[PDB]
C-alpha cells in the first residue's frame, strides 16, 4: 500500500513560478487521486510489471502517473535555475555541445509535446530483452544523456532508461497560472525551478547503476 | 487556407455552464493557434493545399503514420465541430430522428447516456469523445479517441462532439471531469445539430429500410 | 505510372539540404553507416532520415519495376512500414536518425 | 418462409422482379403449361394467349381497341407492379452560394504568378464567415443594384484569367493524351473529336461543394446516372443494383436536375473523375447499394499492385499473420557487404599464394583492379587478418544499426499504445480463416 | 446444362426459400423462364466496375546467418541434401565479433539443407568452397543493370456479352459553391430534404424555412447579398460572369433493367430486340447484356441460388 507524501518544500515557496492554489490542487487532488486509485487496485517494480512489454495492465496508468508526479516534485526547488556544474556539466557539454543548445532543445521538446505528456532527460543505460543485445566493445559514449518525450503516463524507465529530470507538459500542471502560454511556463520552469543538485544526484545514481551492471 | 470560424453563439452565451474565460482561451488562442499553424504549413505545399478538409485529415493521417500537418488540420476540424455540437440552453431530451436511432442501436437513451459518460470518464489524457455513425454497419456508436484523431480517418461521420482536453474545462471544473461530462449532457449538448449531421449522413449511409415488392 | 514513386510511397527528399536545416537536425553527431557494392533487403518499421555525403543509392520498393534515384547531398526520410530494397554500385556512407512517433 | 427469403434475396443477392417482355409464343408457353401437358385449355388467360399466337388476330384486336400498333408495341414495355410514392423534394432553406476559386488551382506542373495565386487564395478563408437566415434581409440588392458591374469578384476574375490562359495553353495536349490513353469514349471520359465544343469546362474549373445545373444523359444499371454539367467530363451519381428498380421511376434520361460535386479525381486513374449526388430530386432515401471504392483503370503501365493501390486509396494486399512480435526478435548483425569483402579476401589470399609459389557449382568472378595487393603482400611478408577486422567493423555497424532501430521501435510501441495508434500497417496481416560448437 | 458461363436470374414463379434448409435447390410453383446473364484475382486492386485494359585455414572460411563456408574431412550426401541431426564433418570459422541467432546449430552434428560449390576465380586462379546453408530482413532485378469487373465471385463484362441496340442563354454548369447556413448546424449545407428525412431531421425552429421552390442568393467577397429577383430562378454564371435563368424552378419506351425475348418488336420500322437485360439507357440507344431464357414447367428444380455463377455444362 503506497502513500502520498507532501512536497519537501512549502506550498507558498514556489511563488510566482507556481501558485499555491496550483500546487495544492495538483498535489492533493491529482497525485492523491492517482495514489489512492493505485492503492485500491493493489514503485519501479509495479510500473515495470504493469507495462507488460506493451499491453499495459489496468493498474499501469495510476502507478505510472504517481511515479512521474513523485519524480516531478523532487526536481523543483524554490532556489532552482541557473546552470549545473561538474560531471553533469561535462556530460551536458558532451551530449549537447553547449548549455544553451541543451536548454533550447529541451524547451523545443517540451513545447512540441502534443497533448498530455511529459518531456524527459534520461541516462542511456538500457538493456533489451533479446539475445545478441550486448556490445562486446563499449565505447563509453553509448551511455549518454538523451531527450525523450512521452504521452500520458509513459516514462523512459519502461525502456530500461534512467530518468534524471522531467517537466510536466500536462495542461493541468500549468493551466491555472500560465493558461495555454506553454512557452512562458517552460521558460519559467527552466530558469527558476530546475534543481541541478537533484539532477546531479540522479546522474550519479545512474552511473552507479551502470557500474553495478558492468560487473 | 482555412479561416477561424466563430462559434454560432456569443462567447458569453454558455454562462454559467461554461464561463467566458474558457471561451476566450479555447477559441482566442487555442483554436486560433491551430488555424494559424495549419495555414503556414499549407502555404508551403501545393499538394496538401487543394484537398478538402476531410480529404486533408485522411491524407495527412497516412494510415496510422501521421504527417506533420495532421495535428493542425485535425484539431481545427474538431473545434468547429465542438462549437456547433453545443448550443445555448442545450441538453434535455433529443427528439425525432436522433431519438429512435439512439434507442435502436443502444436500447434506450438511458443506456446511451451511461455509455457516453464511461467513454469520457475512462479517457486517459487529452482526447475526444464521439457519437458517430458507422458507414459499413449503419448504426450509431460511441467512440473514445486520443489527441487530435477524429473518426473521419475511419470514414465515419461524427454526430456529437465532446472535448475532454484539460484546457477545455480546467477553469470551471478542473480535475472534476465527472461532473463536467454530466453538465455538458444536461445543459450544453446540442441535439438540434445532431439532426442535420445525421441528415447529412443520410446522403451516404441510408439508415432506412428498402421497399421490397411481393412478386 | 504517371505518379512518381516518392509521392506514392511517401518519401520526403531534401536534395541539396542547406546547412541551416542540417545543423538544426544535429547531423554532425550522428553515427555513420558505410557500404560498398551490396544489396540490403530492409523493411522500415521505424521512420529514419538519411543524409548522403559520398556515394549513390538506388531504392526499389517491393515489387516495383522502377527505382528512386538518390544522389549525394540529399536528405531522405524513409517512411514507416516501407518494404524497399537498397542497391549500391559504389562505396557509400551516410548519416541517419531513427525517429519514433512525434519527436521531430 | 417465403417472405423473409425474398427479402434476403433482395438485400444480399440483388434480386428484383424486372419485367420480362415476352413474345406471344413465350407468353403462351408460360400461360398454357400451367394447366397440364395435353389438356383442353380453360383459363381465360391461356385462351387469350392461344388466340394471340396469330398476328392477324392481334391486329384485329388492336383495331378493335382503336389504337395504333406502334404504341401497342411500346405498351409492352410498361413497368408492372406497384409504383413508388412521388418525391416531395423540400429545400432546406434558401440556396446561398458564393463564387470561390477551386483550392487545387493551379494544376501540377503549371507555374503561375505567386502573388496572383495568394490574392486568389484569400477567398478560401471566407468559408469561416457565418451566414444566418435571419440576416439575409438588411442589404438585399435587387435589380440594378445587383448588376454584374457592381460585383466584387476580383479574386475570381484573376482565377478566371489564369484558367483561360491554362486552357488555351493545354487544350490540345489534353485531347492528345485522351486519344492516346482512352481507346474508346465512355461517359466520364474526355469529350473529344467532333463532339467537343469550345467553352466546355475543364476539370480544374470544378471542385467539391459546387452546385451545378445539369441534364441526365445516361443510365447504367451497375454504375449509376451520368449528368452533363457543362464540362468536358460528365458527372457521375453512383447508383447500382436493386435501387434502380424504384429510382428508374424518378431518374430518367433528359430531365434537368440539381447536383452537388462530392469528389473530383484524376481521370487517368479513376473511371469517373467527377462524382456527384442528386440535390433535386432527393433520392438519398432510395439508395442502399454503395460503392466501397470508386472504380479505377488498370493500365498497361501498371505492373505493381502496390503502386496501383497507392495511386488510389485502396488497402494493401493482406497476408497471413506471422504471429511473431517484431520487438522480441533478435537484432541483426550480418552486413550484406561482408560477402563482397569475403570474395575480395579470398581473391587476395589466392593471389598471394600464387605469387609465393611463382615469384551445384557457382563461379564468383573477380578482377584484380578492385584489390589492395600491396597491403596484402606486406601482411604476408610479416607472417585474424585485416579483412577479418573489416568484416568485424562492418558487422558492428550493422549491429548498432539494429540497436538504434530497436530502441526507436520500443519508443514507438510506448507512444502508440499510450495513444492508441496502430502498431502494424492497417490492411495487412489479417487474422485466421481469412484465406555445442561455441563451447569447443 | 448451361450453354455459356453466366449468372442466374429469375423474376417470379420461383420460390426464394430453398426446398431444404441446407441446399440451393428451388421449386417452381408455376411456369417461368430462368435467365442466364452471360459473363466472361487480388481482392485489393480488383473491385466492382474496374476497367481492366490488361489480362489478369579458418581465416579462409566464413559463417553467417543460417549458413557457413568451408574451403577434418567433409562428408556430403549424394543428393546434396542434409537431414536433421546429420554428420557432415568429423576452429572452422574466424569467430566473428557478432553472431545472430541461427535455426541451424553445430554440436560435428548439423541440426536445426542444400549444399553447392562456391568458386572464386581471379586471373585463372581457382579455389572452390563448400556452402552449407538454409520479413524483408530475413531475405538471404538490379536497377543499375479488355473487360469490366463485376463483383458481388467475379464476372467480366466486355463486348463479347454486351452490345448496343439502336440575362444570357441557359446552359448547364456550376452555380457556385454553396456555403454553410449556421441555422442548420451543418458544415456542408443540406439544401434539400425528402419525405423520410423531412419528418426525421427537421427542427421545430426550421419549420418555416422549408421552401417548395428554389430561392437563390449570391454573396461576393465583401459580404453583400445579391438576388436580382426575389420571386424568380436567377443564378450567376461563374465563367461568363452574367446572370441567367434556371430551367424548371424545381417545384422513354424501354425501361432500365427490363428483360427481352429474342424476337420482341418495338416498332414496325425497327429491327427486333433480342434476349437480354437493359444495361445502359441513352438518348437514342440501349446497351443490352445478353441473356438466355430457359422454360421450366411447374415442379422443376432450380439448381442454384439467385445471382449464382454457372459455368459451361453446369446443371
Ligand atoms: Fe501532472
Ligand atoms: Fe479543444
Strand order in the sheet with A162-168: A145-151, A117-123, A162-168
For chain D, helix (H) and strand (E) counts, in that order, are: 12, 11
Sign of the CA dihedral running D352, D354, D356, D358: negative
Among all bound ligands, the one having the nearest atom to the CA of B169 is 2
Q: In C, which residues are within 8 Å of A112 by CB distance?
A: 102
DSSP D176: H
**Helix-, strand-, coil-residue percentages of chain D, each rounded to 5:** 40, 15, 45
Q: Report the C-alpha gap between B78 and B59 in whole angstroms.
A: 16
Cell matching residue E10 = 429469375
A133 touches chain E (CB under 8 A): no
Q: Report the C-alpha gap between D266 and D236 in whole angstroms.
A: 14
Q: Specify whether the CB–CB gap between E195 and D85 falls below 8 A.
A: yes
Nearest residue on chain C to A106, judged by CA atoms?
C103
Q: In E, which residues are within 8 Å of D360 by CB distance?
A: 80, 114-117
Nearest residue on chain E to B206, judged by CA atoms?
E197
Angle (nearest 5°) at CA E166 between D283 and D259: 25
Backbone φ, ψ for residue D37 (5° rounding): -80, -65
Nearest CA-CA partner of E217 in D279, D212, D147, D96:
D96
E231: how many CB neighbours lie within 10 A of its CB? 9
Strand order in the sheet with C32-35: C12-13, C75-78, C47-54, C92-99, C32-35
Alpha helices in D228-276 (DSSP H): 243-247
Q: Specify whether the CB–CB gap between C80 and C90 falls below 8 A.
A: no
Three-class secondary structure of residue E184 per DSSP: helix
E67 touches chain D (CB under 8 A): no
Distance (Å) from CA A179 to ligand 2 centroid: 13
Angle, helices D373-382 vs D386-419, to 10°: value is 110
DSSP E94-114: ---S-----S-EE--EEE--E
DSSP E196-230: THHHHS--GGGGGGEESS--EEEE-TT--EE-S-S
Neighbours of chain D (3+ CB pairs under 8 A): A, B, C, E
Q: In B, which residues are within 8 Å of C10 by CB distance?
A: 62, 65, 67
A167 conformational bin, left if phi > 0, alpha if psi -120 to 50, beta if neither: beta
Q: In B, which residues are within 8 Å of C49 by CB distance?
A: none
Q: Match 504527417 to its residue by C-alpha cell.
A: B67
The H or E element spanning position D21 is strand D20-21
Q: Report the C-alpha gap between B153 and B74 in whole angstroms.
A: 10
Nearest CA-CA partner of E249 in D236, A45, D91, D269:
D91
Q: Report the C-alpha gap between D227 and D277 in whole angstroms.
A: 10
- How many alpha carbons fall within 13 Å on the CB side of residue D275? 17
Cell matching residue D136 = 439575409
Sign of the CA dihedral running B18, B19, B20, B24: negative
DSSP D57-108: HHHHHHHHTT--HHHHHHHHS---SPPPPPP--BEES-EEEE----TTPSPT
DSSP chain A: -------SS-TTTTTTTS-HHHHHHIIIIIIHHHHHHHHHH--HHHHHHHHGGGS--TTHHHHHHHHHHHHHHHTB-TT--S---THHHHHHHHHHSSHHHHHHHHHHHHHH--SSEEEEEEE-----SSSS---SS--SSSS-EEEEEEETT--GGGGT-EEEEEEE-SGGGTTTTTTT-HHHHHHHIIIIIB-HHHHHHHHHHHHHHHHHHH-
Measure Cα distances from E274 to D79, D267, E34, E162, E266 in Å: 19, 34, 16, 12, 11
Nearest CA-CA partner of D279 in D231, D220, D217, D211:
D211
> Could you check whether the bond before residue A16 is cis, i.e. omega within 30 degrees of 0?
yes
Q: Report the C-alpha gap between D247 and D289 in whole angstroms.
A: 12
D72 touches chain E (CB under 8 A): no
Neighbours of chain E (3+ CB pairs under 8 A): A, B, C, D
Q: In B, which residues are within 8 Å of E196 by CB distance?
A: 208
Nearest residue on chain B to D129, judged by CA atoms?
B5
Experimental method: cryo-EM
Q: Specify whether the CB–CB gap between A57 and A173 falls below 8 A.
A: no
Q: In D, which residues are within 8 Å of A56 by CB distance?
A: 417
E150 touches chain D (CB under 8 A): yes
Nearest residue on chain A to B175, judged by CA atoms?
A30
Q: Specify whether the CB–CB gap between C84 and C60 falls below 8 A.
A: yes
DSSP B27: I
Three-class secondary structure of residue E266 per DSSP: coil
Q: Match 408460360 to its residue by C-alpha cell.
A: D30
Q: Specify whether the CB–CB gap between B157 and B204 falls below 8 A.
A: yes
E42 touches chain C (CB under 8 A): no
Is C4 exposed, middle or buried, given 0-12, 13-18 or 19+ CB atoms closer than 10 A?
exposed
E139 touches chain C (CB under 8 A): yes
C56 touches chain E (CB under 8 A): no
C20-59 residues touching D, CB cutoff 8 A: 31-40, 45-48
Q: In D, which residues are within 8 Å of E167 by CB distance?
A: none
E100 touches chain A (CB under 8 A): yes
Three-class secondary structure of residue D343 per DSSP: helix
Q: Report the C-alpha gap between C1 and D301 in whole angstroms.
A: 6
Q: Specify whether the CB–CB gap between D19 and D1 falls below 8 A.
A: no
Q: In B, which residues are within 8 Å of A33 by CB distance?
A: 175
Q: Report the C-alpha gap between D65 and B206 in whole angstroms.
A: 46
Distance (Å) from CA A70 to ligand 1 centroid: 10
Among all bound ligands, the one having the nearest atom to the CA of A66 is 1
Cell matching residue D207 = 471542385
Cell matching residue A82 = 541557473
Put simply, the answer to whether C58 touches E137 (Cβ < 8 Å) is: no
**Pairing state of beta strands D297-298 and E51-52?**
parallel
D385 conformational bin, left if phi > 0, alpha if psi -120 to 50, beta if neither: beta
Q: Report the C-alpha gap between C62 and E191 in whole angstroms.
A: 47
Neighbours of chain A (3+ CB pairs under 8 A): B, C, D, E
List Cβ neighbours of A132 (8 Å cut-off, separation of 6 or more). Answer: D330, D331, D333, D399, E98, E99, E100, E101
Q: How far is C99 from chain D (nearest CA, A)?
A: 6
D169-188 residues touching E, CB cutoff 8 A: none
E96 touches chain D (CB under 8 A): yes
DSSP B118-148: HHHHT--SSEEEEEEEETTTTEEEEEEEETT
Q: Report the C-alpha gap between D2 and E26 in whole angstroms.
A: 11
Q: How far is C62 from chain B (nearest CA, A)?
A: 18
Nearest to A131 among D330, D411, D413 (CB): D330
Q: Specify whether the CB–CB gap between B180 and B169 falls below 8 A.
A: yes
Q: Specify whether the CB–CB gap between D88 and E194 falls below 8 A.
A: yes
B200 touches chain A (CB under 8 A): no
**Pairing state of beta strands D235-238 and D274-280?**
parallel
Nearest CA-CA partner of D62 in D54, D189, E222, A168:
D54
Distance (Å) from CA A25 to ligand 1 centroid: 11
Q: Report the C-alpha gap between D307 and D296 in whole angstroms.
A: 13
Is A143 exposed, middle or buried, given 0-12, 13-18 or 19+ CB atoms closer than 10 A?
middle
DSSP D152: -
Cell matching residue E11 = 423474376
Backbone φ, ψ for residue D286 (5° rounding): -105, -5
Q: Specify whether the CB–CB gap between B128 and B181 falls below 8 A.
A: no
Angle, helices A99-112 vs A87-96, to 10°: value is 70
Cell matching residue D274 = 467527377
Amino acid at each position: 500500500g503506497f502513500e502520498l507524501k507532501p512536497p519537501p518544500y512549502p506550498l507558498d515557496a514556489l511563488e510566482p513560478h507556481m501558485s499555491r492554489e496550483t500546487l495544492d490542487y495538483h498535489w492533493g487532488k491529482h497525485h492523491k487521486t492517482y495514489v489512492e486509485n493505485l492503492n485500491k487496485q493493489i514503485l519501479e517494480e509495479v510500473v515495470l510489471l504493469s507495462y507488460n512489454r506493451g499491453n499495459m495492465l489496468p493498474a499501469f496508468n495510476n502507478a505510472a502517473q504517481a511515479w512521474n508526479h513523485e519524480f516531478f516534485w523532487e526536481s523543483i526547488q524554490p532556489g532552482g535555475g541557473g546552470k549545473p556544474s561538474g560531471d553533469l556539466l561535462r556530460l551536458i557539454e558532451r551530449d549537447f555541445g553547449s548549455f544553451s543548445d541543451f536548454v533550447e532543445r529541451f524547451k523545443a521538446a517540451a513545447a512540441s509535446n502534443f497533448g498530455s505528456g511529459w518531456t524527459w532527460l534520461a541516462y542511456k543505460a538500457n538493456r533489451l530483452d533479446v539475445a545478441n543485445a550486448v556490445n562486446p566493445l563499449p565505447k563509453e559514449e553509448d551511455k549518454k544523456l538523451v531527450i525523450v518525450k512521452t504521452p500520458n503516463a509513459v516514462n523512459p524507465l519502461v525502456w530500461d532508461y534512467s530518468p534524471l529530470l522531467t517537466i510536466d507538459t500536462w495542461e493541468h500542471a500549468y493551466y491555472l497560472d500560465f493558461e495555454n502560454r506553454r512557452i512562458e511556463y517552460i521558460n519559467t520552469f527552466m530558469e527558476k525551478l530546475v534543481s541541478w543538485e537533484t539532477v546531479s544526484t540522479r546522474l550519479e545514481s545512474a552511473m552507479a547503476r551502470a557500474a553495478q551492471r558492468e560487473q | 487556407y482555412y479561416g477561424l470560424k466563430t462559434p454560432p453563439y456569443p462567447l458569453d452565451a454558455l454562462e454559467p455552464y461554461m464561463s467566458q474565460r474558457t471561451l476566450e482561451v479555447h477559441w482566442g488562442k487555442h483554436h486560433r493557434g491551430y488555424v494559424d499553424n495549419l495555414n503556414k504549413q499549407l502555404g508551403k505545399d501545393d499538394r496538401l493545399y487543394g484537398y478538402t478538409m476531410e480529404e486533408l485529415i485522411k491524407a495527412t493521417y497516412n494510415n496510422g503514420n501521421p504527417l506533420p500537418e495532421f495535428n493542425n488540420a485535425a484539431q481545427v476540424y474538431n473545434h468547429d465541430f465542438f462549437w456547433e455540437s453545443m448550443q445555448p440552453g442545450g441538453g434535455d431530451m433529443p427528439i425525432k430522428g436522433v431519438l429512435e436511432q439512439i434507442e435502436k442501436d443502444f436500447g434506450s437513451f438511458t443506456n446511451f447516456r451511461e455509455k457516453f459518460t464511461n467513454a469520457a470518464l475512462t479517457q486517459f489524457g487529452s482526447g475526444w469523445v464521439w457519437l458517430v455513425l458507422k458507414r459499413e454497419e449503419r448504426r450509431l456508436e460511441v467512440v473514445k479517441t486520443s489527441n487530435a484523431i477524429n473518426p473521419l480517418v475511419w470514414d465515419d461521420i461524427p454526430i456529437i462532439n465532446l472535448d475532454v482536453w484539460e484546457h477545455s474545462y480546467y477553469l470551471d471544473y478542473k480535475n472534476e471531469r465527472g461532473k463536467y461530462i454530466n453538465t455538458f449532457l444536461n445543459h450544453l449538448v446540442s441535439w438540434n445539430a445532431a439532426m442535420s449531421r445525421m441528415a447529412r449522413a443520410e446522403a451516404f449511409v441510408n439508415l432506412g429500410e428498402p421497399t421490397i415488392p411481393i412478386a | 505510372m504517371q505518379t512518381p514513386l516518392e509521392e506514392l510511397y511517401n518519401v520526403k527528399v531534401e536534395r541539396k539540404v542547406s546547412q541551416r536545416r542540417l545543423e538544426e537536425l544535429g547531423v554532425s553527431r550522428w553515427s555513420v553507416w558505410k557500404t560498398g557494392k551490396c544489396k540490403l533487403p530492409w523493411d522500415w518499421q521505424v521512420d529514419q532520415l538519411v543524409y548522403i555525403e559520398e556515394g549513390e543509392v538506388r531504392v526499389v520498393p517491393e515489387g516495383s519495376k522502377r527505382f528512386m534515384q538518390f544522389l549525394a547531398g540529399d536528405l531522405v526520410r524513409y517512411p514507416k512500414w516501407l518494404e524497399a530494397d537498397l542497391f549500391f554500385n559504389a562505396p557509400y556512407s551516410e548519416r541517419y536518425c531513427f525517429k519514433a512517433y512525434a519527436d521531430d | 418462409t417465403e417472405d423473409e427469403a425474398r427479402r434476403r434475396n433482395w438485400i444480399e443477392r440483388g434480386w428484383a422482379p424486372w419485367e420480362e417482355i415476352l413474345t406471344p409464343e413465350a407468353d403462351f408457353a408460360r400461360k398454357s403449361l400451367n394447366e397440364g401437358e395435353e389438356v383442353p385449355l380453360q383459363s381465360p388467360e391461356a385462351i387469350e394467349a392461344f388466340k394471340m399466337l396469330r398476328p392477324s388476330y392481334r391486329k384485329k384486336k388492336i383495331k378493335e381497341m382503336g389504337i395504333t400498333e406502334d404504341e401497342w408495341y411500346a405498351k409492352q414495355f410498361e413497368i408492372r407492379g406497384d409504383k413508388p410514392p412521388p418525391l416531395d423534394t423540400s429545400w432546406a432553406g434558401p440556396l446561398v452560394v458564393r463564387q470561390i476559386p477551386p483550392r487545387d488551382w493551379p494544376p501540377k506542373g503549371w507555374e503561375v504568378d505567386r502573388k496572383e495565386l495568394e490574392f486568389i487564395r484569400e477567398a478560401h478563408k471566407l468559408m469561416a464567415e457565418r451566414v444566418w437566415l435571419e440576416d439575409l434581409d438588411k442589404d438585399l440588392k435587387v435589380g440594378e443594384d445587383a448588376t454584374v458591374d457592381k460585383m466584387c469578384l476580383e479574386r475570381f476574375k484573376v482565377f478566371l484569367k489564369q484558367y483561360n490562359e491554362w486552357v488555351e495553353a493545354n487544350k490540345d495536349r489534353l485531347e492528345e493524351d485522351s486519344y492516346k490513353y482512352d481507346q474508346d469514349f465512355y461517359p466520364g471520359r474526355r469529350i473529344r473529336g467532333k463532339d467537343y465544343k469550345e467553352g466546355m469546362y475543364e476539370l480544374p474549373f470544378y471542385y467539391p461543394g459546387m452546385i451545378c445545373e445539369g441534364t441526365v444523359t445516361t443510365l447504367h444499371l451497375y454504375q449509376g446516372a451520368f449528368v452533363d454539367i457543362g464540362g468536358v467530363h460528365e458527372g457521375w451519381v453512383p447508383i447500382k443494383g436493386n435501387d434502380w428498380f424504384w429510382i428508374r421511376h424518378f431518374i430518367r434520361v433528359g430531365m434537368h436536375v440539381i447536383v452537388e460535386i462530392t469528389a473530383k479525381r484524376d481521370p487517368y486513374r479513376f473511371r469517373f473523375p467527377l462524382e456527384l449526388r442528386f440535390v433535386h430530386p432527393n433520392i438519398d432515401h432510395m439508395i442502399f447499394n454503395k460503392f466501397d471504392f470508386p472504380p479505377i483503370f488498370h493500365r498497361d503501365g501498371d505492373t505493381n499492385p502496390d503502386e496501383i493501390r497507392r495511386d488510389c486509396g485502396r488497402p494493401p494486399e493482406p497476408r497471413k499473420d506471422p504471429g511473431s512480435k517484431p520487438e522480441e526478435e533478435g537484432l541483426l548483425s550480418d552486413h550484406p557487404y561482408v560477402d563482397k569483402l569475403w570474395q575480395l579476401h579470398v581473391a587476395e589470399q589466392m593471389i598471394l599464394d600464387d605469387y609465393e609459389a611463382n615469384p551445384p557449382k557457382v563461379i564468383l568472378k573477380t578482377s584484380v583492379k578492385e584489390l589492395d595487393l600491396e597491403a596484402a603482400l606486406i601482411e604476408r611478408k610479416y607472417h585474424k587478418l585485416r579483412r577479418n577486422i573489416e568484416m568485424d567493423e562492418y558487422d558492428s555497424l550493422h549491429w548498432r544499426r539494429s540497436l538504434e532501430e530497436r530502441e526507436a521501435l520500443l519508443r514507438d510501441i510506448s507512444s502508440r499504445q499510450a495513444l492508441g495508434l496502430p502498431l502494424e500497417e492497417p490492411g495487412r496481416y489479417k487474422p485466421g480463416s481469412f484465406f555445442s560448437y561455441d563451447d569447443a | 446444362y448451361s450453354d455459356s458461363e453466366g449468372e442466374m436470374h429469375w423474376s417470379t414463379d420461383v420460390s426464394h426459400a430453398p426446398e431444404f434448409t441446407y441446399s440451393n435447390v428451388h421449386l417452381l410453383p408455376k411456369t417461368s423462364h430462368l435467365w442466364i446473364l452471360s459473363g466472361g484475382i487480388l481482392f485489393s486492386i480488383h473491385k466492382d466496375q474496374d476497367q481492366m485494359n490488361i489480362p489478369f585455414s579458418d581465416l579462409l572460411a566464413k559463417r553467417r546467418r543460417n549458413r557457413f563456408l568451408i574451403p577434418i574431412s567433409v562428408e556430403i550426401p549424394i543428393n546434396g541434401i542434409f537431414r536433421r541431426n546429420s554428420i557432415f564433418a568429423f576452429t572452422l570459422f574466424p569467430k566473428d565479433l557478432f553472431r545472430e541467432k541461427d535455426n541451424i546449430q553445430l554440436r560435428l552434428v548439423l541440426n536445426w539443407v542444400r549444399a553447392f560449390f562456391v568458386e572464386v576465380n581471379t586471373k585463372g586462379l581457382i579455389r572452390d568452397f563448400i556452402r552449407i546453408g538454409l520479413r524483408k530482413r530475413n531475405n538471404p532485378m538490379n536497377p543499375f543493370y479488355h473487360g469490366t469487373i463485376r463483383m458481388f465471385s467475379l464476372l467480366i463484362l466486355s463486348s463479347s456479352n454486351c452490345f448496343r441496340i439502336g440575362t444570357i442563354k441557359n446552359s448547364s454548369g456550376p452555380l457556385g459553391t454553396a456555403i454553410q447556413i449556421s441555422n442548420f448546424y451543418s458544415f456542408l449545407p443540406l439544401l434539400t430534404y425528402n419525405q423520410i428525412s423531412v419528418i426525421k431531421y427537421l427542427q421545430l425552429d426550421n419549420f418555416k424555412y422549408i421552401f417548395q421552390v428554389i430561392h437563390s442568393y449570391l454573396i461576393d467577397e465583401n459580404g453583400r447579398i445579391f438576388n436580382l429577383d426575389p420571386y424568380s430562378n436567377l443564378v450567376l454564371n461563374p465563367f461568363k460572369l452574367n446572370w441567367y435563368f434556371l430551367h424548371q424552378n424545381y417545384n422513354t419506351i424501354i425501361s432500365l433493367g427490363q428483360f427481352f425475348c429474342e424476337n420482341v418488336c418495338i416498332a414496325k420500322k425497327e429491327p427486333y430486340l433480342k434476349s437480354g437485360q437493359v444495361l445502359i439507357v441513352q438518348r437514342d440507344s440501349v446497351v443490352i447484356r445478353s441473356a438466355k431464357p430457359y422454360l421450366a414447367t411447374p415442379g422443376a428444380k432450380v439448381h442454384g441460388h439467385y445471382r449464382e455463377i454457372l459455368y459451361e455444362g453446369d446443371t
